[PDB]
Each structure stands twice: as structure tokens, then as C-alpha cells.
Amino acid sequence: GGYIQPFGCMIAVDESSFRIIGYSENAREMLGIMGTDVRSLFTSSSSILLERAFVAREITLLNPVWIHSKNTGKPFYAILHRIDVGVVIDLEPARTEDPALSIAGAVQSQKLAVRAISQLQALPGDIKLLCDTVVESVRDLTGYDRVMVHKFHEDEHGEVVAESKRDDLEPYIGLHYPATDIPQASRFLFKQNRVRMIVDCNATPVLVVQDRLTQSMCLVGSTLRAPHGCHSQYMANMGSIASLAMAVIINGSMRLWGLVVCHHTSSRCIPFPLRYACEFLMQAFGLQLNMELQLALQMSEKRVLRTQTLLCDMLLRPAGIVTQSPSIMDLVKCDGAAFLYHGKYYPLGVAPSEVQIKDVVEWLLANHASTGLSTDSLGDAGYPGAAALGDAVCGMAVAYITKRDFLFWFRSHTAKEIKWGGRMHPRSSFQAFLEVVKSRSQPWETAEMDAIHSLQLIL
Amino acid sequence: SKAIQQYTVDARLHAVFEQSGESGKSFDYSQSLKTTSVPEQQITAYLSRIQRGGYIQPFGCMIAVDESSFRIIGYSENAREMLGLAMGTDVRSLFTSSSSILLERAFVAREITLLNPVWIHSKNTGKPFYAILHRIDVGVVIDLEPARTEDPALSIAGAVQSQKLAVRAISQLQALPGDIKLLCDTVVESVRDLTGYDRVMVHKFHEDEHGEVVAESKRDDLEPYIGLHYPATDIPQASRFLFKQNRVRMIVDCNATPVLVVQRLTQSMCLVGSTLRAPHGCHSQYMANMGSIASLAMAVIINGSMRLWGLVVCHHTSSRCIPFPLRYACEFLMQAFGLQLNMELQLALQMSEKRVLRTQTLLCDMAGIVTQSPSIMDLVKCDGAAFLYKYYPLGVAPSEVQIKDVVEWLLANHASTGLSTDSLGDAGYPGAAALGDAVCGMAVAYITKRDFLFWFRSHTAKEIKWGGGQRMHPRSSFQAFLEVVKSRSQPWETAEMDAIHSLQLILR
Amino acid sequence: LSDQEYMELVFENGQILAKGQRTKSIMDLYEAEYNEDFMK
Ligand SMILES: *C(C)[C@H]1/C(=C/c2[nH]c(/C=C3N=C(/C=C4\NC(=O)C(C=C)=C4C)C(C)=C\3CCC(=O)O)c(CCC(=O)O)c2C)NC(=O)[C@@H]1C
Numbered sequence A: 001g002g003y004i005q006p007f008g009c010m011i012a013v014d015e016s017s018f019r020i021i022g023y024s025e026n027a028r029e030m031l032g033i034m035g036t037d038v039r040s041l042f043t044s045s046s047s048i049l050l051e052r053a054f055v056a057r058e059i060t061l062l063n064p065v066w067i068h069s070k071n072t073g074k075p076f077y078a079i080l081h082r083i084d085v086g087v088v089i090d091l092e093p094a095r096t097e098d099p100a101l102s103i104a105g106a107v108q109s110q111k112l113a114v115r116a117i118s119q120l121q122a123l124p125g126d127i128k129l130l131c132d133t134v135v136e137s138v139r140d141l142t143g144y145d146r147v148m149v150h151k152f153h154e155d156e157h158g159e160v161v162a163e164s165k166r167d168d169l170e171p172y173i174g175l176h177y178p179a180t181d182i183p184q185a186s187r188f189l190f191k192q193n194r195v196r197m198i199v200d201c202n203a204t205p206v207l208v209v210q211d212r213l214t215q216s217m218c219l220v221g222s223t224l225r226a227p228h229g230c231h232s233q234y235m236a237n238m239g240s241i242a243s244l245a246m247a248v249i250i251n252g253s254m255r256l257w258g259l260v261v262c263h264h265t266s267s268r269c270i271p272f273p274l275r276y277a278c279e280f281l282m283q284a285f286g287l288q289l290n291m292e293l294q295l296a297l298q299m300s301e302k303r304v305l306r307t308q309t310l311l312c313d314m315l316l317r318p319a320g321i322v323t324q325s326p327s328i329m330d331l332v333k334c335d336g337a338a339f340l341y342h343g344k345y346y347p348l349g350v351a352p353s354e355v356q357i358k359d360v361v362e363w364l365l366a367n368h369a370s371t372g373l374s375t376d377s378l379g380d381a382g383y384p385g386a387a388a389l390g391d392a393v394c395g396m397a398v399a400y401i402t403k404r405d406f407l408f409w410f411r412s413h414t415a416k417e418i419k420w421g422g423r424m425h426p427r428s429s430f431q432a433f434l435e436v437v438k439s440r441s442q443p444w445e446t447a448e449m450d451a452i453h454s455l456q457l458i459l
Numbered sequence B: 001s002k003a004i005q006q007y008t009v010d011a012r013l014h015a016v017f018e019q020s021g022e023s024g025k026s027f028d029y030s031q032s033l034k035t036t037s038v039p040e041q042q043i044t045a046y047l048s049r050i051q052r053g054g055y056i057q058p059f060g061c062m063i064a065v066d067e068s069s070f071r072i073i074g075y076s077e078n079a080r081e082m083l084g085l086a087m088g089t090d091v092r093s094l095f096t097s098s099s100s101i102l103l104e105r106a107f108v109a110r111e112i113t114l115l116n117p118v119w120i121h122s123k124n125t126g127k128p129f130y131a132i133l134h135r136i137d138v139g140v141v142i143d144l145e146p147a148r149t150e151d152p153a154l155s156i157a158g159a160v161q162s163q164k165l166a167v168r169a170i171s172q173l174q175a176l177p178g179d180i181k182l183l184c185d186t187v188v189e190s191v192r193d194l195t196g197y198d199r200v201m202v203h204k205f206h207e208d209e210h211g212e213v214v215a216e217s218k219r220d221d222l223e224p225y226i227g228l229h230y231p232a233t234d235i236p237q238a239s240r241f242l243f244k245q246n247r248v249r250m251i252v253d254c255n256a257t258p259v260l261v262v263q264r265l266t267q268s269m270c271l272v273g274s275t276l277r278a279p280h281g282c283h284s285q286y287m288a289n290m291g292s293i294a295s296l297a298m299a300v301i302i303n304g305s306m307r308l309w310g311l312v313v314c315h316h317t318s319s320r321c322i323p324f325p326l327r328y329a330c331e332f333l334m335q336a337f338g339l340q341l342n343m344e345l346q347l348a349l350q351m352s353e354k355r356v357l358r359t360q361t362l363l364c365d366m367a368g369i370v371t372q373s374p375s376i377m378d379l380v381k382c383d384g385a386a387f388l389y390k391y392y393p394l395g396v397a398p399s400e401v402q403i404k405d406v407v408e409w410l411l412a413n414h415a416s417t418g419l420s421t422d423s424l425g426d427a428g429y430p431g432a433a434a435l436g437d438a439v440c441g442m443a444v445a446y447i448t449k450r451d452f453l454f455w456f457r458s459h460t461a462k463e464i465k466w467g468g469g470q471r472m473h474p475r476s477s478f479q480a481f482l483e484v485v486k487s488r489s490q491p492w493e494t495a496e497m498d499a500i501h502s503l504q505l506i507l508r
Numbered sequence C: 001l002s003d004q005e006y007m008e009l010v011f012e013n014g015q016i017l018a019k020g021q022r023t024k025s026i027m028d029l030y031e032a033e034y035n036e037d038f039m040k
């Protein structure tokens, strides 16, 4: 069996007969204590609560169960989930032994969530402000030494887009890392239980003993699951001894937009009420973020349509499209652009020389002789050159207008706009990412190709 | 604005109701609305009565404590009854040691309290209470709402189940097709399942501040209300203001006997921060007439600086008192609904702008603006339109002679680059009667000394349908509303006038 | 985060107006207040 973090216990019992299938090694010590009835290890009301949880059609509705051990009477929070052959309960000790304080905390787990979400309501089309507000709220609730918002990109590589740290620590905003740092399995696991918590990396994992059993049960859904070899040492290097990642889920069938990752320089365990306050705040944050993304898409469509209308007005009033304040560099987020017309070359911004464009159009007529390619790396696309262009002109989007008249949008390598100052470690990840996109521009988004095609089809 | 003017009307109606009660007579809703400046004393008295009152609902205790030495400075008459006590004694002696200490901690904290509400136990009986504290300009108010004598695990389980049901409702909300009506229906069903009330409705406040029932979920025995429009005065502005602070308003039993609040002090205590605040007499009469014995209302606040877009109203045909955690869950679900609704409204505005832009372009390309598919009537929401050069009728429009007379009146009294009226009679057109209610509202755009663009719209009730007045009852409210809008059409929005003037400029 | 403060409508002058009545983190507040020493 796998391993679990030593701050909690796990007991796996048969769904029907309520007998022990398996258990973590430390369970017997933590409870004050194979194949035996589980209900004899707790008080009676606890046993009826457990039976109600088991019989429930959707066990998730009764997850955080308040239970008392029969041998000590101390309270535990149980969380239940059905693996494929039974049920598993993760037991975390509760700090408060007072029923009054317990009820007060359970109620203010909701009160704090509502209070925090009120601030999100207060904000007036600005994802940056939203992310900073969320980070500040989460740092106030949790008290971690660092909180950041990682956004995942179309290429599945992440960027730290917001942060809130101590004064003594170093900033990470603007840091990019390759997608391989977060395995795809974990990204899948974040559409499952949406909160990962690591209390202390430098902690001996505890073995899960299983009974005469078939293929070992999967702990992929448990919350006490120990961290893996990569990430434990990666964190030890990074200088973070505790962590708490919370998924940001939006619509897209649901998709993962990013994470809210918190780091602490020492072992830390957040109480349940604040944990659930954070969970509810995350739900609200994802909702608002999804709506913001939709509205941003609509506004971008509006802007592109107006730009295209002006360009059409001029184009019907040839070359003048590339001579006025509005120009072909306004449809797309491009470092440069160019227009070939009757053999005349009209470059704007970072564009290659005339002979270079003649060579590239000859190459196009040789290999892609069509309507127009679009690549984030000219050298990789099959262009024999791309060394004379250095890092100034890397990605190209082409639109064929005639047999000799063409439109080009040029984009420089994806390190020009990346600004961050400064073994498994963030610096190594940044250098690896820079190697990955070497001479590679940003992807030409689908909407941008739609705009280019709209301009093309009307000329 | 009309919202600020409505305070005088509220004061007048409140005075009329008080007079009718004094004389022992009935309250004549129809004539009260028909016949209704005001001295500052009357408005001050109205606001003090609503917000100072003196009575609470008899489903809990209220105690006011002075922050110094914890001395009582006022309490409801039933406080002793539940706490199985005199003005100027120690509140900490009523409860047990642990509860007293937790209350001291709730007192000490500043700018935020994590012991609020507090689970306390009375000294003499051990009865569990939820103590809810807040600050008033003379001390603190403690609302004691009784609790159920169950094991702590069961209270925690109830709170957990309420939380999870709210979470499921929000998950269903987010995972919806891109339609405000579907959102309203979904939230109506979710809230009805969560709470357990016999009826749930969504009220939308219009530009005139008058309400409307846009969604509803009821048991099959009750009469439906979806589709009803009632005048703005049914909800006084003081309550709407209070709704942006107390997002959840609960009335347990409209037929219960209010309890007097016993109270050095110069003025009556303020109860706007208390949930035990009993309702006014005439809303209790309204509820009795409707047949609703309980009620629960939740505010739909959207960012517009927060606006009250509307309300979600729950009704039960008998007394009903839900616990506090379920009220928290309802508030959370309402916050999610408000966020979604705000963003839906913004998206709808953007789509409307897009559609109007496409229509304007098509019209500019190609009087062809009438004798073609995307004609002028598509520019704005109207029941008809016309272009006067010769006259080109289209849709519900006045005859050539009627429009000729309208133009003569426009020249006589306005000479002006545009008109936007929702009632020709209110404007003062002599021939409005000859148009009946087909042509009530008119928008006119000037093209030149002789060319005009007309957009005609008919009376509001044309698009208002519901299955149904001296007594205060929903039928009386609907009849009064229909009385208000007689020769008046729907109001021309700002966006519609922007589009009208855009086309005017482009044509000229 | 902070506690809710309530505002009372008044009719002052010739206008209606609403008249009114931290360094530690929420975790530190929770630890400070939900503490069980006072029960020996
Ligand atoms: C191992 C050779 C590879 C790898 C594996 C790996 N990664 C995760 C999950 C995470 N790693 C993250 C990455 C970062 N954390 C940071 O602080 C920064 C930058 C400042 C980076 C780049 C993130 C995000 C996570 C979240 C997981 C979490 O628990 O918080 C895992 C999951 C293991 C587990 O026990 O859950 C694994 C095995 N990471 C590498 O660097 C290389 C490529």
C-alpha cells in the first residue's frame, strides 16, 4: 500500500459488512487503541453517523463527520470516499474539544466565506485586480508566508501572475516554468478533490497496511496521501516546508485555469473552518473568473471588428492601409508586420529586410504553394534560414492576397516580454523554460487567425 | 429621482394607515394610492417608527448591554420567560461560567469577532441559545435565538448538510448553458429545495422601482403568481434600504403577538441591526390577506455602488422558523446568484450593442430603410414605426392624418432634435384619445425641416398577463398597477435613444 | 475582513442620509479566541 502524511489516519472498511479492509500504521496509536467491525472503535452516536454516511447515495454530502473515539473520547474529523471495493475514512484530530467552540467554528466557516466573497462582489474587466484581491484575502485567512496564483497556458505551462509574500522573501511574479513540472496525472486529480495540502515535507510517510486482497486500492482520492519523490525535494530546495494548492475550475465540461499555491517556511496545519472558508472563496473566485473571461472575449471581438472596419474604410480609399495610425499591427498582438504589394515592401516595427522577405516568399511558393501558414517558429516550420533573423523575427503569420501581394505578422521570441530577476529549483525551471521556447514566439491564437482571415477574405 | 421622491409618498401612506387604525376603520388601498410636500417632522416620525419601533418577534429574547461592567439597559418582556433579571444588573450572571467567558471574549474583540454567534447555555435551565451580537450607538444588542436539544454532532451535521446543499446549488448554477430566465428558474428550485417553503418567487425591480414576479416554484395546491406587476409603493424605500444591510429578512408568524422592548436613555433603541425586529401592522395585514403565515426574503445585490436588482421571496402557509446556518447557506447561494446575474446583464448589454451595430450597418448600406427586411423597426424595440418624407407606415402606426396632426403639434410646441415620450397624454398631445392605447409611446428623430423617423410603442398592459380593491391583496395590487399605466407605454431606455440618435446623425 | 456595521436613515437638513452607529491575521485571531485554557 501507499503512504500517508503522519498528521492523520486512514481506515478502509467494507461498504456492507463494516469490517476493516486496511488501515494506516499509526491509526492504533492515534485512536488510543484487521477484519473487525469498525463501529466498535467509536462512540454510539458516532456509529450511527458513520452508518448514515455509508448508506448515503452521495457520500460527499456527509464528508466532514464529527466523531469521538471510544477509548479516549477525543474528537476527530472524518472524511469518507468509496474507492472501488469499499469505503475509506481519513481521520484528522480536531484541536477543539469544546462542543460550543466546535459549533461556533463550524458556523463561522460559513460566516468568513460570506465576508470574503463580499469583497469580490465589491470589485467593479480586470483579472489582475481580481487575482490580487483573491491572493490578499487568502493570505489574511490562512496566514501563509507566500501566496501566488499560477495560470496555465494553452501549452500547459504555468506563469505566476499574482503574489503576496513577506518583506524578507524574494518575488516570483512573472516566472515561467515548463509544463512538465506538474504531471498530467495531478492536473487530472485537481478536477477531483480540489484541495491538496502538505503539512511538512521533511516528515516520514506512514505505510498503509492492506489485508487476501486484490489489486491494491488507490489512494488518489485521499487527503492524507504522502508527497512524491520529485515534489518533496523540489520543495526542500525551494525553501518551502508546507504547502496548500487549491484548484481554479472554470467552464470548458469543466477545465482547470490555474492554481492558488501557498508556501510557508515551516510546518503549518490550517484548522478546518478556515480551510472550508478558503474552499468556498475559491468556488466564488472560479465563477467570477469564468464570467470575466467570457466578457473579455466579447470585448476583444468588438475591438477587432472596429479595427477591421477602419482598415476596410482606408483599404477602399491599397497601400494606404499600412500608412495611417490604424494599421495591420492593430488586429493582432504582433511585434511587427509587413505588406508586400506589387513588389513593394512596407514593413512596420520589427520586420526583416527586403531580400529576406523575397527569400521567404520564394520558400513559401516552393513548399506551401495554399492560403497561408502560421507558426511560432519559422526555423522549425521548414525554413532553411531563420539564423539571419536571430531572435527579432521568430514567429510568422501569413495571409495570401494574390500571387505576389501578401500580409505578414511577425512576433519575436517568447523571452522579450518575460521579465524575472534571478538541481530542482525555480531558477533551473526558468532556464529550462527559456530553452524550451528558444526562438519560439507566442502561439497565434484561433481568434487572431479568425481576424486575419476576415481581413483576407474581403480583399 | 423617483426613489427619493417615494419617501414622501411612503410617509403619507403610513400616516393614512395609522389614522385608519386609530379610527377603527378599514384601510382603503385603492383610495389611499389614488389620493397619495410633507413636514420634516412627519418624515422623521415615519423613519423613527420604522427603525426605532419598540417591538420584536416572539421567537427569541433581546438584551441590550452597556459595554462597561456588562449592565443591562433594556430587554424584551419575554426575556425572563425563556431564561427560566432587572434593568441595571450583570448579564454575565444569567449564563454559565463558560458561556459568560465566551461572551466576554466576544465583547473584547474589536473590528472582527470570531465568537459571533456564540453557543451559550442558560444558568438556571441549561437551555442552549445562539447569541447574536451587534453594536448600537449606546451599547450592544444580544439576540438570543433558542437552539435544539440535540447532541453537538447533530448540530454540526445540520450545518454541514446545509453547506453542502448550498455548494451543490452553486455548482449547478455555474455549470449552466450561456439566458437569465434559466438562471432564475434554477435558483428558485435550488432555494425551494434547500429551505422547504411552500412557495418561492423572484421579484425584479424595474426602472420605475415597481416590482414583477419573473420566476416561481410552488406546491400544486396554491394559486400561481408568476407574471404579476404591482406598484412600487408596496415596498417602502426604508425597507429596500434596510435590505442592503440585512440581506436576509425572516418573519416567523404574522399572527403572533409582538413583545414590547423595555428600556437614562434619551431615545428608543434602534432595531435595524436586529433580526427579531417585528414587521409593521399593514404588512402583517397584507400577509394575513394573502394567507402567508411565515416569510423569508433575500436580497439580490449586483454591482451597478451596489444596487438591489430584486428579491427572492419565500412563503409558508404556517409558522416556520429555520435555523441560522441555513440562513448562512441561503445568503451564500444568493451571493453566487448575484455574481452570475451581474455578469449575465453585462454580457447581454454587449450583445445588444453588437446587434444594434450590425443593424445600423445594414441600414446604412440600404426609402429603402422601410421597404426591406432589416428595416427601421429592428433598430429599437417598438410595436411600429414610420418614415415621413409622403408617409411610409409600418406596423402599428397612426393614419396619415393622425401623424400629420402629431407633426403639426410637434412643430407648434417643440419646433428640437428628438422626442422620447412614453405617454402622449402626459406630454399633452390634444389628439391622444383618438389613438386609443395602440399608439401610447412615441420616439421621434428629426432628419430635416420635413423628414421624420417615428417609433411607436403601445401600452404596457398589452404584454402583461396574469390569471386574476379596497382590501390589501395581490389582486388589488395588480388592479392598482394597471390603473397607474393607462395611456402609458414602456419607457424608452438610454441605449435605444443612443441608437436612434446614431441613425439620425448617419442619415443627415 | 471586518464585522458588519449598520446605518440608520435620517432626514437631516432637507435630505435623507444614512448615519452610522487590525494587524493580526484571521488565523492568529482564531488561535487567540478559540482557546480552551479557561477550562482547567
Ligand atoms: C519531477 C522530475 C518533475 C515534477 C513533478 C511533480 N510536480 C508536481 C506538482 C507540482 N509541482 C509544481 C510546481 C511548482 N511549484 C512551485 O513552487 C513552482 C514555482 C514557483 C513550480 C514550478 C506545482 C504547482 C505543483 C502542485 C502540487 C502540490 O502538491 O502543491 C507533482 C505532484 C506530487 C505530489 O505529491 O502531489 C510532481 C510529482 N516537478 C518538476 O519540477 C519536474 C519537472
Ligand SMILES: *[C@H](C)[C@H]1/C(=C/c2[nH]c(/C=C3N=C(/C=C4\NC(=O)C(C=C)=C4C)C(C)=C\3CCC(=O)O)c(CCC(=O)O)c2C)NC(=O)[C@@H]1C
Pocket (backbone or CB within 6 Å): B013, B014, B017, B203, B213, B225, B228, B230, B233, B234, B235, B236, B239, B249, B251, B278, B279, B280, B282, B283, B286, B295, B296, B297, B313, B472, B474, B477
Ligand atoms: C403599508 C401601508 C404599505 C406597505 C408597506 C410595506 N411593504 C413591505 C414589504 C413588502 N411588500 C411586498 C409586497 C408583496 N409581497 C408579495 O408576496 C407580493 C405579491 C405579489 C407583494 C405585492 C414585498 C415583496 C415586501 C417584502 C417582503 C419582506 O419580507 O419584507 C413592508 C416591509 C415591512 C417589514 O417589516 O419588512 C412594509 C412596511 N405595503 C402596501 O401595500 C402599503 C402601501
